[PDB]
Amino acid sequence: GSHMLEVLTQKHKPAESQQQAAETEGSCNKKDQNECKSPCKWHNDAENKKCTLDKEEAKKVADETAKDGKTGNTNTTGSS
Length: 80
Known about the structure:
Elements: H1 25-30, E1 42-43, E2 50-51, H2 55-62
Antiparallel strand pairs: 1-2
PDB class: immune system, membrane protein
Keywords: cysteine knot, immune system, membrane protein
Assembly: monomeric
């Protein structure tokens, strides 16, 4: 609740709403179908539909090379 940034997710995404944040297994389970965040994992025909956090997905959501910090051309070996 104090991100240094400010922008939620302004990009060429075909959807805008709550800023994509790496949730947790505890939150995902509670999250509804629409609330089922990216880090989570939607389960179809789960007897009554179920959402749960996924480590693999969470890794990708965090390693988006943008959330943690800006990154692109040049970073290692290049500056030499």
